[PDB]
Ligand binder design. Sequence first.
Ligand SMILES: Nc1ncnc2c1ncn2[C@@H]1O[C@H](COP(=O)(O)OP(=O)(O)OC[C@H]2O[C@H](O)[C@H](O)[C@@H]2O)[C@@H](O)[C@H]1O
Ligand SMILES: Nc1ncnc2c1ncn2[C@@H]1O[C@H](COP(=O)(O)OP(=O)(O)OC[C@H]2O[C@H](O)[C@H](O)[C@@H]2O)[C@@H](O)[C@H]1O
Ligand SMILES: [Mn+2]
Ligand SMILES: [Mn+2]
Ligand SMILES: [Mn+2]
Ligand SMILES: [Mn+2]
Ligand SMILES: [Mn+2]
Ligand SMILES: [Mn+2]
Lengths: 153, 153
Amino acid sequence: ERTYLYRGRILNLALEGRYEIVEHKPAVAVIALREGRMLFVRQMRPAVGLAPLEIPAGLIEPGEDPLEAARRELAEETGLSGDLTYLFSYFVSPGFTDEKTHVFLAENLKEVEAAIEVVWMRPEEALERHQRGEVEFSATGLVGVLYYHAFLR
Amino acid sequence: ERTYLYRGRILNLALEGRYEIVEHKPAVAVIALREGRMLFVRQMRPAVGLAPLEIPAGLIEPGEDPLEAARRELAEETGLSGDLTYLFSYFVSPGFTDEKTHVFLAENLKEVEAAIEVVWMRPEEALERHQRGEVEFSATGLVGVLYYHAFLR
Ligand SMILES: Nc1ncnc2c1ncn2[C@@H]1O[C@H](COP(=O)(O)OP(=O)(O)OC[C@H]2O[C@H](O)[C@H](O)[C@@H]2O)[C@@H](O)[C@H]1O
Ligand SMILES: Nc1ncnc2c1ncn2[C@@H]1O[C@H](COP(=O)(O)OP(=O)(O)OC[C@H]2O[C@H](O)[C@H](O)[C@@H]2O)[C@@H](O)[C@H]1O
Ligand SMILES: [Mn+2]
Ligand SMILES: [Mn+2]
Ligand SMILES: [Mn+2]
Ligand SMILES: [Mn+2]
Ligand SMILES: [Mn+2]
Ligand SMILES: [Mn+2]
């Protein structure tokens, strides 16, 4: 049984016996390569007090499925559309939250539309800047970089 | 300025203006290969109501640095010790929490010690079971699988 301590906009906090649980909407993230650059985004993230390197990502809204949310986030954050393929999903931190992220690949990007900074960057370069302490990653940014190195070279 | 709504054992819930923020201890995770198998673990995770495929992981305790926490978690969860190398870090979900995960590689594993299920499994097989819907991943499990495919074949 869950007891709710807080019902919010983007999360709920519950207790389930001794466990502290944060309920959170599911998310999507989009991996996109063009001319050897990966599409990263950065924005201020008050939770961490900095702007980590992320890939385009967002919450799934009411009525939407993951593919539709992925299309919307890509367009809203970067002005692009592409051919989207589902890759895999993961729980961001299942020791305390149910947030699940669905990850897509986007191909054949086109500008559909001309706060969030678009940062095209070679993944090799993102990984080197991170190893040197120059940038932090979100899980989505790291998953994009590792996926590229595994499968897209 | 943060306003605190809840101060807990493994998180705090705060408001920072319009943002809902969950403070959380930093974590470590350990990627380990032996004879082509990756060291996964599974445990029931009440937040998600299932046991996703993870790698050995845990919270950094008071007094510890990430390397020490990684050594401890590996031993406590799997009875093993190894030669540990720092790889990279990521924020699990920086749109709402400050949880940061430090990821290590372990080599030359040895049994130091004879709830958490140890699951040695080829990463190729973990990825195929996940694509087929048979298992879910945590971020740490997916990062382990992608890192292997990128760098350890
Ligand atoms: N939700 C909870 N609330 C209260 N206490 C808990 C909770 N979960 C576990 N405990 C207690 O806290 C102790 C913590 O066990 P350790 O191995 O250091 O951590 P980990 O594996 O949980 O988390 C490691 C990362 O992996 C996952 O992605 C997580 O989300 C983290 O990001 C447990 O024995 C319980 O006593
Ligand atoms: N902590 C917050 N609390 C309140 N509202 C917020 C918060 N953060 C953003 N908003 C509002 O909610 C809207 C959400 O913007 P969208 O693009 O769909 O989501 P995303 O990119 O934030 O999160 C995507 C994933 O990436 C990260 O890993 C996250 O942790 C997620 O896992 C914002 O415009 C704000 O109005
Ligand atoms: Mn977003
Ligand atoms: Mn957005
Ligand atoms: Mn912009
Ligand atoms: Mn653990
Ligand atoms: Mn443990
Ligand atoms: Mn066990």
